Protein backbone atom coordinates (compact mmCIF):
# COMPACT_ATOMS: atom_id res chain seq x y z
CA UNK A 1 0.00 0.00 0.00
CA UNK A 2 1.92 3.04 1.25
CA UNK A 3 4.73 0.70 2.31
CA UNK A 4 7.81 -0.32 0.36
CA UNK A 5 7.84 -3.94 -0.78
CA UNK A 6 10.95 -6.16 -0.61
CA UNK A 7 12.19 -7.74 -3.81
CA UNK A 8 15.66 -9.15 -3.13
CA UNK A 9 16.37 -12.19 -5.30
CA UNK A 10 13.12 -11.81 -7.23
CA UNK A 11 13.52 -11.34 -10.98
CA UNK A 12 9.89 -10.96 -11.90
CA UNK A 13 6.73 -10.72 -9.83
CA UNK A 14 3.73 -12.94 -10.65
CA UNK A 15 2.83 -12.82 -14.35
CA UNK A 16 5.62 -10.59 -15.60
CA UNK A 17 5.43 -7.60 -13.27
CA UNK A 18 8.53 -5.38 -13.16
CA UNK A 19 9.05 -1.80 -11.94
CA UNK A 20 10.23 1.28 -13.80
CA UNK A 21 10.82 4.88 -12.71
CA UNK A 22 10.46 8.03 -14.76
CA UNK A 23 12.67 11.00 -13.94
CA UNK A 24 12.33 14.57 -15.14
CA UNK A 25 14.79 17.26 -16.11
CA UNK A 26 14.26 18.84 -12.70
CA UNK A 27 15.14 15.67 -10.79
CA UNK A 28 11.55 14.79 -9.93
CA UNK A 29 10.89 11.06 -10.06
CA UNK A 30 7.99 8.62 -9.72
CA UNK A 31 8.12 4.82 -9.97
CA UNK A 32 5.51 2.45 -11.24
CA UNK A 33 5.01 -1.33 -11.21
CA UNK A 34 4.00 -2.66 -14.56
CA UNK A 35 3.57 -5.66 -16.71
CA UNK A 36 5.61 -6.59 -19.68
CA UNK A 37 3.17 -6.24 -22.57
CA UNK A 38 1.46 -3.18 -21.06
CA UNK A 39 2.23 0.03 -22.96
CA UNK A 40 4.37 2.85 -21.60
CA UNK A 41 1.33 5.10 -21.83
CA UNK A 42 -0.11 3.52 -18.69
CA UNK A 43 2.72 4.62 -16.46
CA UNK A 44 2.76 7.99 -18.25
CA UNK A 45 -0.87 8.66 -17.44
CA UNK A 46 -0.22 7.53 -13.89
CA UNK A 47 2.69 9.99 -13.73
CA UNK A 48 0.28 12.76 -14.65
CA UNK A 49 -2.17 11.74 -11.92
CA UNK A 50 0.41 11.49 -9.16
CA UNK A 51 2.99 14.13 -9.99
CA UNK A 52 0.82 16.81 -11.55
CA UNK A 53 1.70 16.93 -15.23
CA UNK A 54 -0.12 17.09 -18.58
CA UNK A 55 0.45 14.09 -20.83
CA UNK A 56 1.01 15.94 -24.10
CA UNK A 57 3.51 18.29 -22.46
CA UNK A 58 5.87 15.51 -21.39
CA UNK A 59 7.62 13.05 -23.68
CA UNK A 60 9.90 10.20 -22.69
CA UNK A 61 13.35 9.24 -23.92
CA UNK A 62 15.77 6.42 -23.44
CA UNK A 63 19.40 7.51 -23.82
CA UNK A 64 18.74 10.04 -26.57
CA UNK A 65 16.14 7.88 -28.33
CA UNK A 66 12.44 8.74 -28.35
CA UNK A 67 10.17 6.11 -26.83
CA UNK A 68 6.58 6.30 -27.91
CA UNK A 69 3.24 5.55 -26.22
CA UNK A 70 2.84 2.39 -28.29
CA UNK A 71 6.25 1.24 -27.06
CA UNK A 72 6.47 -1.11 -24.17
CA UNK A 73 8.57 -2.71 -21.45
CA UNK A 74 8.97 -5.72 -23.74
CA UNK A 75 9.96 -3.58 -26.71
CA UNK A 76 12.35 -1.29 -24.87
CA UNK A 77 13.55 -4.24 -22.78
CA UNK A 78 12.93 -2.64 -19.38
CA UNK A 79 14.22 -4.08 -16.11
CA UNK A 80 12.68 -4.85 -12.73
CA UNK A 81 13.91 -1.39 -11.86
CA UNK A 82 14.22 0.61 -15.08
CA UNK A 83 15.02 4.31 -15.37
CA UNK A 84 13.33 6.41 -18.05
CA UNK A 85 14.03 10.08 -18.77
CA UNK A 86 11.65 12.94 -19.57
CA UNK A 87 11.91 15.98 -21.76
CA UNK A 88 9.30 18.72 -21.70
CA UNK A 89 8.22 19.07 -25.27
CA UNK A 90 6.81 21.69 -27.63
CA UNK A 91 4.11 20.06 -29.73
CA UNK A 92 3.14 22.98 -31.94
CA UNK A 93 -0.58 22.87 -31.28
Amino acid sequence: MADEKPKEGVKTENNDHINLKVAGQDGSVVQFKIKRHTPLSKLMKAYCERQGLSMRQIRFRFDGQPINETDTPAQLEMEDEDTIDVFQQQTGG
Binding site: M1, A2, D3, E4, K5, N14, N15, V30, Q31, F32, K33, I34, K35, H37, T38, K42, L43, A46, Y47, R50
Partner: peptide, 11 residues
Protein backbone atom coordinates in the same frame (compact mmCIF):
# COMPACT_ATOMS: atom_id res chain seq x y z
CA UNK B 1 6.34 2.26 -3.14
CA UNK B 2 4.27 4.49 -5.40
CA UNK B 3 2.39 3.31 -8.47
CA UNK B 4 0.95 -0.16 -8.88
CA UNK B 5 -0.89 0.20 -12.19
CA UNK B 6 -3.55 -1.71 -14.11
CA UNK B 7 -5.16 -1.83 -17.54
CA UNK B 8 -5.02 -5.56 -18.10
CA UNK B 9 -6.54 -6.97 -15.03
CA UNK B 10 -4.16 -6.84 -12.08
CA UNK B 11 -2.34 -10.14 -12.47
Amino acid sequence: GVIDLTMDDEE
